[model samples]
Target: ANGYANSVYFTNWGIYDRNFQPADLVASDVTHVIYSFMNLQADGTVISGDTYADYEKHYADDSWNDVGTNAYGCVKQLFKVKKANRGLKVLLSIGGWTWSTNFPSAASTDANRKNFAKTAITFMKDWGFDGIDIAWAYPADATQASNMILLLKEVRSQLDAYAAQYAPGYHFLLTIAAPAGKDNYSKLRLADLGQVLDYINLMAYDYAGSFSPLTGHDANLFNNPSNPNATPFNTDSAVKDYINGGVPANKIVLGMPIYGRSFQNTAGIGQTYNGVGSGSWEAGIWDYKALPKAGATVQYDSVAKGYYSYNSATKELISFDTPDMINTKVAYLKSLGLGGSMFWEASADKKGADSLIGTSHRALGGLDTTQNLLSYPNSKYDNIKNGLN
Candidate 1:
C-alpha cells in the first residue's frame, strides 16, 4: 500500500498513442490504472461534455456517441492488462476537472443521485473495473460546492452497497481531490467521508505556476522568500491544516509532480530571484525525462529539503523531484506517519535516469525484498513474479 499509485487518470484517450497501452505501463511498476469515467446514458449512449456550454455544443448535436467503441472497450483492454499482470486492480475515476461541471446537477436531487449511482455501478461492472475513484475536482468552491457533499455521500453509499453484494473484498477506493487550502476543509465534510474512503490523495502540488502574472507553478516545494509569492505554497501550514481538519495522518498521501514549472528570462539574466520576469507553463521546459538534459544545475536546499534548478544560459526556473529530494520526502512521510507519497504521471519520469518508481520502491522498503526489474539487471517481469513466489 505504501508504494501504490494514487490514481492513473489518462487525459488523452481517443488520440490512440503508444503510451495508452496498459502493457507498456507495467514496466513502470504501476499497481493500479484508474480509467477515466464512462460518460454514457442508461441505454449506453455516450454523454457529451459536462458543462452546459460543452453539452449543448457536443452532446446536444449527438456529435460523439461512440461510447462502446471508445470508452468501454478501452477500459476492457485496460482491465485485461491488469488481470494479466497478477490481477492488478483497475479503478474507474469519474468526473475530472472538466466533467465536474455536471456533478452538482447530477447530485442535486435524490432521484438524480440514485440514477447516477446506479449508472456508475453498471458501468463499472460492465467495463470489468474493480472499483471507482471519485475525482470531483472541487464540489462547491469554484463551480458547484453546494451539491458536492450530497454527491459524495451518494457515491460512497452506492459503492459500499455494490461492493457488498457483487464483489466482496474487491477494492473500492473512494477518494476526492481536495483543495490544498486548510480553510476549505470545513466547506466539505472530509471527515464524514474519511470513514467511507480508503484514503484521500492530497494534491499537494500546483502551489505556483506561470498562470499568475507574478509567475509560479504548482508543487514547487520551496518558497523563495526573496520572491515572496513563489511555491510550494501552503507548506507545513497546509499539511498541519489537513491533519487538524480530521484527515488521518496515515491516510494523507502528498502529491509530487514529475515535471517542473518555468518562467521567462526578461533581462536575459537567466533564472534569478529578482521579480522582473514573466512565467508560463511551457510543455517541454522540464518534464522528467528532459530535466537532466536541460543543462540546468541541480541544487538541494537543505532547509527546504526540496530540489530546484535554474539555467543561467536559458534563464529558466524549474522545480522537480530528484533522487535526493525524493529521499527527503519519503523520510518526512515516515516521520509524520503519513500514508505515502504519490507521483502525478508515470510518463513524466525518465525511463532509466533517476526513476521515480525505483525511488518509491526504495523508500517503501520494497527494494530490499522485491526483485525490482527496473533497478535490477536479471529481474524482468516474468522473473520478478517468480521472486515473489
Candidate 2:
C-alpha cells in the first residue's frame, strides 16, 4: 500500500488567540494528527509545558460538558472529536526542535530506553492517545545514534505488547520526523530505525533561511545547482540519501511546510544578498498567510519546482510552498511508494477549495482518482522514474 498517512501537526497552542480548536479540524480526510510537542525528561518521563492546555484549559465550543465546567479542555476536546471519526489516530510528539535536549539521557541505556518507552505508553493510554512521534533533532555521535535504534526497538516492542493486551484489534503507530541532510543519513542507523518505525517523516524543507547569504527556496522538491550557494540540500537529495541508507521508500512520509523562510538583501533570487530579510511576525520567518502585499514579485523556479516572493521595494523575500508546489509533492508521494505527505501545522491552510492539505489529502488518500496522472492540472516533468526526479 502507498503509506499515505496524511498526518498534520496540530499544536494545542493554536487554542489561543485564533481559537483553533479540535472541532475545527475536518477529521474525515486526515488519518493522523500529531498533536505537537511534549517533553522527554532525562529521567525517562514524558511531560508537557502547560497542564492547563494539556487537560484543563476550557473551551466554549465544546459540547462535551461531561469534561469540566460545561467545556472541553485539550485532551477532552480531542476525545470528543475522535468520536466523530473512529479511525483517527491522535499521537503526541515529544521533543520538538526546542525540547530535544534531553533525549540523550533517556535513550542512553537499555534500562533508560525501557523506562522511557514504558512511561510513554502509560502516558499514551492515560491520555487516550494512539501513539508517539519522535522528533529528535539528531543522534550526536555513533553512541547516541545506536541508542536511537535501541530506543525505537524497545518502544515498538512495548507498544505492540501493550496494544495486544488491551486494544486487540488495533496497532500502535511509530513514526519520526527525521533529518534531511546532504550527509545527514550517516548520523543514524537508518536501516535499523526503518525496521522499527511504521514510517519516518522526511523533513525535506528548511534548506535555507535567515542565515543564508543568498535567498533560495527553503523547501524545493528537487535540487537546483542553478541557484547561488546551492548544494544538494533539496528533497530529492535527502530522500535518496535515506533510500541509499537502506530505508525503504514506502516507510517514509515526506514533511511539507505550512510556513516560509524569509530573506532580505541587495540581490535577487539565486544571487548573494546583503543579508537575511524581515519576517512577517518574528524577525526572519513568515507564515504562508502573512506573505507580502499584492505588489510583491512572485516567481516560480522551474529548476527546483518551487516558488518565492520578492518585494523589490522592501527587499523582502520568502521561500514557501504554494498550491502548485503541494501538487508536485503529492505526485511525487504517489509515484515514490512513500507513506504519505505531512505538514507542520493545520492553521496555515486555506479552509476550502483553495486548500493545501486538501490537495494532498485528496490525491494521496485516493479520494481523487487522478493518482496516476502525474501531469494533471499542470506539471510537465514526467521524469518521476521509480521515485526519482
Candidate 3:
C-alpha cells in the first residue's frame, strides 16, 4: 500500500441541520475519517461534544428491536460503515476551535495529562474508533508547546498499551490538527511532534475570513507579490517551513477548505469590506456546494493557484476551492511527495464527480485501499464489539 491518507473531518453536530450521515462516507473513498470533535475539560477529561448526535439520535434504518444495550447514533453508523469498508479507519478528534480554550490549562500538569491520555483511549473504545486526532487550535507559547509534546507522549503511550492489550500487533494512529500560520506553528517543536504523532493534518486554510479586514484567498497554493492583500497565507510557505523545521514531507497531510469565506460590500479582491453578509451556515461563510453564487463570476488566479467568486450585482466576494483549484493543490502535494489531503468538515462538500473529495481521490490516482483498518472488537457497545450483528 502507498500509505497515502485521504482524510475528512466528520463533525458530530452534522446530523442536525447539515444532514451528513456516517453512511455517506463510503461514497467519498477517504482512507481515514477524523471525527470532529470531542470536548476537553479544564481538568483534562474528554467528553462527547454532542451526546444526542454522538450516540442517542437514531436513524430510520436503525434497529428497533435490539436485545441489549446498543449504540444508536453516528458512532454506531460509523462502525457499521467501517465494517463494510475494510480500508477506512475512523478516529475520534478531541478539541477544536471552540473547545481549545482549555488546552493550555489541561496540558499544564502531569496528572491532567495522564487523565487526558487514559480517557482518550476510553473514548475511542466506547465509540469504536481506530485512533485519536488531537486538535488543539494551537499551543500559544513555548511553555504550551512543551506541554503539548508531553500530552502527546502520554497519549501515544496509552494508545500503544491499549492496542497491545486488545489488539496485539496492531497500531493505533495518533495525529494532531496542526496550524499553518507562522506565529502559531513556530511555537511548536515540529521535530518532537513528528516523533510522537503519526502524521500532522496541516490546517492550511483560514488565512482570510470574517476575521480579516480585506478580501483575500482563504486557501492559496502560492503567495503572489503582485496582489499582496489577497495573499495573506499560502500552502507553499507553510509546507516549506514545516520541512525546514524538521517535519518529514510525507508526514504532513495538506488541508484544503470545502467552504468559502465571504466579504460584503466589496469592490473586488484586496479591497476593504464593510461587513460579512449572511451565509449557508454561519455569517460570512458559504459551503463549497453553495458557492459560485447564482450571479457570481468565478475567477481563478493562476499565480496563487486559488479560486474566488465575486458577484458585482450583489457586491459580495467569496474565496474557496473549486474542482480545478483542488486539482492544483493535489498536484502540488503529489509533487512534494506529501502524505495526502484533508478537508475541514464533510457536510460542506458536494456530491458525485463535482465533489472536492472526489476530485482529490481521482487526482491522487487512488487511496491506500489495500491496507486493512482496525475492527474494534473490544468496544464497550454491544453493536460495535459484535460487528453490529
Local distance difference test scores for all models: 0.54, 0.73, 0.87
| Per-residue alpha-carbon lDDT of candidate 1 for residues 1-389, written as tens digits (9 for 90 to 100) | 53434334443342233243444454345555556544633222224223222112222213254332223234434544654554255666676655665666676677777777776665555555556666666665633454555656677788777766655654455666566755455466656555656667677766654444544434544455654444436455666776776777777766667766555562221123343243223342456666754577776555445566667786666666787776776776667777666666655566653877567656755311111111111222222222212
lDDT of candidate 2 over 1-389, digit per residue (tens): 23367778888777886567777887776777888888888976777777777766756753433422221357667766565666567887888888889999989878889988987777566566778899898777888889888898898899888766766645677888898875556789988877888879888888887666566778887777666354336788778778888889888888888888776664566666665656644577676766534768778888887888888887777778887788889888778777788888776666775567777877775531111111111111111111111
Lowest lDDT sum, 10 consecutive residues, model 3, at 368-377
Which residues of candidate 3, in runs, are more than 4 Å off?
26-28, 370-374
Candidate 3 lDDT over residue span 1-389, tens digit each = 36678899998888888888888764446888998889999999999878888888888888678877788888888877787778888888999999999999889999999999988899788788878999999899999999999999999998888878887877788999999899899999999987887789999999997788888988998888999898988889989999888888888999999999999999988789988889998888898989888899999888888889989988999999999888888899989989899998888998888889888988988677744444567777777778776
Best by lDDT: 3
Q: Ranking under TM-score, best-scoring first?
A: 3, 2, 1
lDDT of 1: 0.54
Q: How far is candidate 2 from the true structure (C-alpha RMSD, Å)?
A: 9.9
List candidate 1 segments past 4 Å from native. Answer: 1-9, 12-20, 37-73, 141-146, 169-171, 183-186, 220-227, 266-286, 366-389
Against the true structure, what is every candidate's RMSD?
9.2, 9.9, 1.3
How many residue pairs in model 2 have overlapping backbones?
Answer: 5
Residue-level lDDT for 199 in candidate 2: 78
lDDT for predicted candidate 2 compared with the true structure:
0.73
Clashing pairs in 2: 3-339, 4-339, 4-340, 263-277, 264-277
